[PDB]
């Protein structure tokens, strides 16, 4: 059914499916107090991420087990791009929530997190410099969930791979349509598509580094880990 949507319906769909912005629990942070807040926040946002996924056009047509494998490998890239996007208009700060605006220096309060902040901030500026739009943003977040684990899913898997690649193509049509409607020159549209798609690369990299840090902090008993968040943490190692 999803394969039959126009560029405008897919855009609308995705715009309606966006999850809400959550708040953080209420002098200087400690290593433990700071991971406790981020973790308590990421754990509340995954429940919302599960229900945003289901509304992404085409996701529910996958076998349950492909649905899990996809959320299981993309959860931290989806959390990262939402963060970058809400931090866009606050140069030098990461807006974890409306009541938790952290800067590079607070990043130093937790061992080895500053490098992770530094990359989130650089992607945040990158998106500011290109002037990313909300319509584009929603398309990117869907490509990220569909491209997390297609090379990690044999006759029903090749069938599920093709359906997945068909959604990806429609999302690629949508993005091309958004840029045409804002008057980009034909040349300019593929230059911007490719620039958006190379930032996903960086996002994948922030993610792998993010899992490592998380799992380090967990193995040092620095933070207890939430039920849904632990489950998802374990899908990567395991």
């Amino acid at each position: 059914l999803a394969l039959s949507l126009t560029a405008d319906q897919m855009v609308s769909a995705l715009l309606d499916a966006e999850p809400p912005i959550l708040y953080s629990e209420y002098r200087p942070f400690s290593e433990a107090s700071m991971m406790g807040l981020l973790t308590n926040l990421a754990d509340r946002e995954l429940v919302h991420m599960i229900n945003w996924a289901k509304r992404v056009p085409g996701f529910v047509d996958l076998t349950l087990h492909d649905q899990v494998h996809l959320l299981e490998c993309a959860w931290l890239e989806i959390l990262m791009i939402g963060l970058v996007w809400r931090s866009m208009e606050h140069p030098g700060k990461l807006l974890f929530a409306p009541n938790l605006l952290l800067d590079r220096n607070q990043g130093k309060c937790v061992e080895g997190m500053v490098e992770i902040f530094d990359m989130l901030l650089a992607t945040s500026s990158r998106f500011r410099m290109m002037n990313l739009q909300g319509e584009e943003f929603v398309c990117l977040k869907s490509i990220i969930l569909l491209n997390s684990g297609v090379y990690t899913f044999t006759l029903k898997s090749l069938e599920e791979k093709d359906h997945i690649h068909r959604v990806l193509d429609k999302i690629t049509d949508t993005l091309i349509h958004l840029m045409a409607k804002a008057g980009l020159t034909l040349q300019q549209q593929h230059q911007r598509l490719a620039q958006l798609l190379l930032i996903l690369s960086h996002i994948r990299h922030m993610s792998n580094k993010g899992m490592e840090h998380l799992y380090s902090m967990k193995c040092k008993n620095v933070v207890p880990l939430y039920d849904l968040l632990l489950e998802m943490l374990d899908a990567h190692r395991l």
Partner: peptide, 9 residues
């Protein structure tokens, strides 16, 4: 099974 219970609901 957290994730699964939420895909079925």
């Amino acid at each position: 099974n957290a994730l699964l219970r939420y895909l079925l609901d």
